[PDB]
Amino acid sequence: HSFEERYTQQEILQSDRRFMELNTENFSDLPNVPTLLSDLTGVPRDRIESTTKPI
DNA sequence: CCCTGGAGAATCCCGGTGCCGAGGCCGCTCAATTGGTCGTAGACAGCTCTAGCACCGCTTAAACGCACGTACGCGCTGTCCCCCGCGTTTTAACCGCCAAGGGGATTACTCCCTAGTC
Numbered sequence: 001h002s003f004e005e006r007y008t009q010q011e012i013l014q015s016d017r018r019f020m021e022l023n024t025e026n027f028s029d030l031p032n033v034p035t036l037l038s039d040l041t042g043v044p045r046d047r048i049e050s051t052t053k054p055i
Numbered sequence: 056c057c058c059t060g061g062a063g064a065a066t067c068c069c070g071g072t073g074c075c076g077a078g079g080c081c082g083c084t085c086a087a088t089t090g091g092t093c094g095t096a097g098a099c100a101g102c103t104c105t106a107g108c109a110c111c112g113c114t115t116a117a118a119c120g121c122a123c124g125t126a127c128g129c130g131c132t133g134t135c136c137c138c139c140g141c142g143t144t145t146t147a148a149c150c151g152c153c154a155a156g157g158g159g160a161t162t163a164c165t166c167c168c169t170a171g172t173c
Contacts, residue, residue: 050124 010051016041017052 004012020033020040029036034048 013052017048017054021054 007015017033017037020037021030023036024030024032033054034045037043037048037052038045
């Protein structure tokens with residue numbers, strides 16, 4: 001029972017971007033979240049800004 | 056593909072007779088006019104006083120364009136579910152039937168209130 005099944009792709013990606021937004025310790029790295037997530041999983045910043053829906 | 060002759064049926068409408076009440080007519084009738092008073096409250100200044108008209112230079116706070124962007128009102132698809140028109144049944148007021156009081160008037164017996172004369 002993988003959590004990728006109970007939680008859909010959108011939900012696991014939301015958990016991931018919340019994780020990366022917990023990684024930062026300052027204001028300045030909040031726009032660095034798309035860059036960090038693209039470095040992590042290789043997703044373009046377009047869908048990061050379009051579908052992640054951050055805090 | 057979509058239009059309609061015929062038919063079923065609802066509408067508009069004026070004769071066409073019966074009814075009850077809108078309006079006129081009659082008999083009171085009571086309240087608005089009107090004489091006055093006398094004194095009350097608002098018009099007429101008048102002094103006052105008090106908030107606003109326009110003016111000056113700033114201050115960035117809102118206002119607006121531009122560009123991205125993105126998701127929602129609306130319009131497309133389909134089904135499904137549920138309410139209507141019609142057919143059958145049952146409460147639901149309304150008007151007749153009957154024998155007995157209640158009573159309101161209505162009149163009959165009578166009995167006291169009234170009033171006359173040898």
